Write a protein that binds this ligand. Structure first.
Ligand code: FAD
Ligand code: FAD
Lengths: 575, 575, 52, 104
């Protein structure tokens, strides 16, 4: 139709939070995505939930790379001077290959990218869903930490339900243990280690159903047999281009859409408009609709409407390395065994005593090791071949204000790193918190356009220079110190800062606070755009604090709160 | 059910050929694929048919890499000696990371890979569908070239219909022209250049619907509204493991399947069994069913059943480079223009005279160029930004017995190659023909198993040493000579032979001929396994000749012929 | 190696490689300034870069 | 086996070696600066024909060594620069600096 109760722009996990809540409460809901259905028959599901990926996990890095399209690529200035004399040769560094001439290459988030597919980035994400501690967390209630705490605990608990967050899916991993147990011993009881909270449900010792948008809301059109009184339509391959403001900037009056298959343009009317296009694309849509300021920022002319839009952006510093498990940890795996003879020979034996108390490990472990060692005498490691991967974290705390992940991501190894047994390899990712600063901006060209003919995004970003930078380097050191407890670096995966924005944890582009002016912000704690009765924004762009933990669960929690406001303030149309 | 008229193993374009023909003729058909549905709502469709890929085409290289799983990876012998002293360090080059200890690293097709998804490799392929000339083509009729010719022309015409092959989709490309027109001028009229025959239909100046398995057969379960009298079921995530032979080796009696979701194993009964699992996986399934010989080949004990199975394998030599368009070709684009002034200045002008006869180009071209030059004076090339890519070939001929593709594949450029404007870049792929030789083998370990617990594939392959090798090097030279007519090599993409088997044109693993013994072969010209009434094989594994052209259209044509035999010899069950 | 050790480049243009993986604490350029004996006169695209 | 093919470059007035009036080298001498492109007609045509000739000729002996594929080397890596103070019979007529006795 051209009229709905609610329209939601974006079918990521945040848009699906809105759909779950509002479709369930009886609203006539339409959802538009610029991308298309491409996870199988479960619409918007995790693409890593095939048998083939989970039997060939390192190949999934390719699926991720294939759907990360860089936000802003500066003009290239590499000198190619070995062209043949006959080949056409540039006289200048002209604009080539979709580069953005607005972009300062030295003030960029070059790693920033976007994903345009039904289910958004939740079709590929790592599914880490920690809660934020107060230090990282936006206030929802002022002057009452207890009420604030109580609200966040309620919302986070609901969001963990939606995502099926759990901390138990990797408990029988030898490697997971080996890592966690060593680290927790070494920190004087002052840094707790636990499993990474993961939005996932294990189905078997070798298959994990990773959560996604589809987990939150199945994205099937309604009414259907299972939900005969619900009303939901998903429209893929539709670019949402502009929301139309009234004169007072108190209401949105229509949404302009562009059907990318037919080419046709329409306008859609709703009672409520929710924008969940991502931290970048929410901002782009708003700026193309007259919010904030189009073009290169100019202080001698501040925007009247949403002046903080696209300012105070945050992205986390990310450090990474891999390690190769120490000899001492590997010997510890098999500490409870008596081993006689040499592998492969007639006399070789590996035994342990069931249920014994001098033993460091329980029977489940010792049986796995014994059986692996006796059945695979060609193999020099005591770790079973199908041992699940480590999933360890010590969460952000005041004394170490960074998030940590000590685990395995799907990885593309150089041929020489494929030299090292995967059982030995552990990935380390430490994520820093970035102070929000007005000078750090996402803005949109008034002349350059992207692949969808929308104003080209441009970053003007540097990590702040005092606390943020001090912490980022302390965080690198902490990774170096901590990782050395488990093993030395893997050659080729030495400690390093990753390309700015490769972490894809951008926030603050349309930030939340209590007062538009006082808190330099765009949406209130109901995620409602100041001044507007009927426009709401969802996503990490809402988060106004410096945070190091993975933001999505927090964004979801804010969206639940926003949905409560809509339920309190808009009546669904009769079915 | 556990009983069907026809069961087909594999939902690639060849399995879908069988489904199209047999479902349409009234058979009760089941199809099993080990992989899962993952191209959107069009089941088994081309993954490049999203708006986002066609607006970001180089990202598709990643989707391809993500679903190419190496067939046989030798044990790694790279020396990593910069591990930290504390890290666990190997004393030998032991079997790591799924490597195959059977595999001689020096007699491999290391590039060979397989794709396990509904629609197989046709969800990512380049869609080139040339016919084979007689020199490359298997005989279907002996001692009557006219009857042979007539049969191939009929079958190829049908297969081109199924795939929607055309040669017109790139006709208004400046780059396509620039290339083709230059080359055809340079070969004395003795090498014809045409558009690559492509299985694709253009929908707009910027969107092409590439064909796939889905084009051939939509893979929807039947009966349905559109086909209420047809009977078809597709079962994804089912590993087909063994066909059961009777004692006489005259019939297949059941198919053992393993449901990978539930874990459960079943047996399925059919009247007819078709194996279309690919050139590698057809062979694997047969060897796991008692055909040929399991384990390392041993001449002192030749297989009784299908002795040529897995012998006489062919894979094409592939050479590649890219070029950067010559200055002379780029100036030729704008030959009909009068150009006055300097770009960007008040006085600058670019004009041509419509319909004039001194003009090298037609008006459509000159308007495109003029408008690009006047509207984009910042841009130093005369080629429109959205100009479609070149799609040129001179087909295999006796005097130059290799296939050629002069075009653009989706490519991952190094940052320095992203330095060169994509409009200037042309990809060159030349494909050689490989003589079939008994010594060139695909065999399966009796002890090592792959990720699906099936006997591990192992190659023993070298390109033959006389004709095949002579031609392969002549083909490299020909690419060097021909490409120089268009421009110099692109640094980073210099002329080279690609990793053996990266081309994925393997044939001859279960080859066709007239007589099992005389022609050293496994299936007859109806693709029926010798001796067996009811077992048929489809795919490139059937092709017994040395061929350089892309094989799939030929494999499809053989499958059409095989389907005719089944229609002539098996009665469908009543609906 | 002996050859490479006694070939000193004639004219090295100003470097414009983007190093954006410096630690936040490290001093980071705001422009492609003249560094490491480079020649700001030199057009990188009209050079004999190999000359030594 | 190594293959090096060396082309001939037409002398063109526009191809220059000049020296900065402000930038100095390591010996505090005026900094050398090049303004050079391989000429576009004969020189360039021959250079690409020469590449092809190397490809054709080398194939008679064996295939390329991976890692050492056919390529143009960085301009001037060959170190065969000429014509910077060129010889001729007449300074003006032959656009030159020294005579056939190499006298300025
Ligand atoms: C890529 C990735 C992300 C990721 C991660 C690892 C990788 C490689 N690991 C994470 C983790 O472990 N924990 C976590 O909390 N986050 C992690 N992430 C990031 C996470 O995926 C995102 O934070 C989350 O997906 C964001 O959700 P949101 O719903 O706000 O946004 P989205 O997923 O980007 O979906 C946005 C959708 O909107 C569409 N779109 C965009 N523009 C338009 C317009 N103009 N019109 C219509 N629709 C639009 C997109 O196509 C998209 O699907
Ligand atoms: C990968 C690719 C392929 C390709 C190409 C470029 C790329 C990067 N370009 C080509 C081109 O331009 N022209 C052409 O003719 N070929 C080109 N190709 C190769 C082409 O894709 C293949 O030749 C064609 O797809 C082969 O078709 P076929 O139907 O015989 O086989 P398949 O696509 O590999 O599908 C096989 C299926 O069987 C399944 N399977 C495998 N094992 C089992 C078992 N045991 N049980 C059940 N099912 C099984 C697979 O999952 C698969 O889908």
């Amino acid at each position: 139709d051209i009229k709905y109760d609610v329209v939601i722009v974006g079918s990521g996990p945040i848009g699906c939070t809105y759909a779950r809540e509002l479709v369930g409460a009886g609203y006539k809901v339409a959802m538009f995505d610029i991308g298309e259905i491409d996870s199988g028959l479960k619409i918007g599901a995790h693409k890593k939930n095939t048998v083939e990926y989970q039997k060939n996990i390192d190949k999934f890095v390719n699926v991720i790379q294939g759907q990360l399209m860089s936000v802003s690529v500066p003009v290239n200035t590499l000198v190619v001077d070995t062209l043949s004399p006959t080949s056409w040769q540039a006289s200048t560094f002209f604009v080539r290959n979709g580069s953005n001439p607005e972009q300062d290459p030295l003030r960029n988030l070059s790693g920033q990218a976007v994903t345009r597919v039904v289910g958004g980035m939740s079709t590929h994400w790592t599914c880490a869903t920690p809660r934020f501690d107060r230090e990282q967390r936006p206030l929802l209630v002022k002057d009452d930490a207890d009420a604030d705490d109580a609200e966040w605990d309620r919302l986070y608990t609901k969001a963990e339900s939606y995502f099926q967050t759990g901390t138990d899916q990797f408990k029988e991993s030898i490697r997971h243990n080996l890592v966690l147990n060593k680290l927790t011993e070494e920190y004087k009881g002052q840094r707790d280690f636990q499993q990474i909270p993961l939005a996932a449900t294990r189905r078997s010792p070798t298959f994990v159903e990773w959560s996604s948008a589809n987990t939150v809301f199945d994205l099937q059109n309604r009414p259907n047999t299972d939900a005969p009184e619900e009303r939901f339509n998903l429209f893929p391959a539709v670019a949402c281009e502009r929301v139309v403001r009234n004169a007072l900037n108190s209401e949105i009056e229509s949404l302009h859409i562009h059907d990318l298959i037919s080419g046709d343009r329409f306008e859609i009317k709703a009672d409520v408009y929710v924008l969940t296009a991502g931290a970048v694309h929410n901002t782009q849509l708003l700026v193309n609709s007259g919010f904030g300021q189009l073009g290169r920022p100019n202080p001698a002319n501040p925007p009247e409407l949403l002046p903080s839009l696209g300012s105070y952006i945050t992205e986390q510093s990310l450090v990474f390395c891999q390690t190769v498990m120490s000899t001492e940890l590997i010997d510890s795996v098999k500490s409870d065994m008596t081993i006689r003879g040499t592998p492969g020979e007639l006399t070789y034996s590996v035994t342990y005593t069931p249920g014994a108390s001098t033993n460091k490990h329980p029977d489940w472990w010792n049986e796995k090791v014994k059986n692996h060692m006796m059945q695979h005498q060609e193999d020099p490691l005591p770790i079973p071949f199908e041992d699940p991967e480590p999933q360890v974290t010590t969460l952000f705390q005041p004394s170490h204000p960074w998030h940590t992940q000590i685990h395995r991501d799907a990885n593309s190894y150089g041929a020489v790193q494929q030299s090292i047994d995967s059982r030995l390899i552990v990935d380390w990712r430490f994520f820093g918190r970035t102070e929000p600063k007005e000078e750090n901006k996402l803005w949109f060209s008034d002349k350059i356009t992207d692949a969808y003919n929308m104003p080209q995004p441009t970053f003007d970003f540097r990590f702040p220079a005092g606390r943020t930078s001090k912490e980022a380097e302390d965080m690198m050191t902490d990774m170096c110190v901590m990782s050395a407890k488990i093993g030395g670096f893997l050659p080729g995966s030495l400690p390093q800062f990753m390309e700015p924005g490769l972490v894809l944890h951008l926030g603050g582009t349309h930030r939340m606070g209590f007062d538009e002016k006082e808190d330099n912000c765009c949406v209130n704690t109901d995620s409602r755009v100041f001044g507007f009765k009927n426009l709401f924004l969802g996503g990490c762009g809402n988060i106004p604090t410096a945070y190091g933990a993975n933001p999505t669960l927090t964004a979801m929690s804010l969206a639940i709160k926003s949905c409560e406001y809509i339920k309190q303030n808009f009546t669904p149309s009769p079915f």
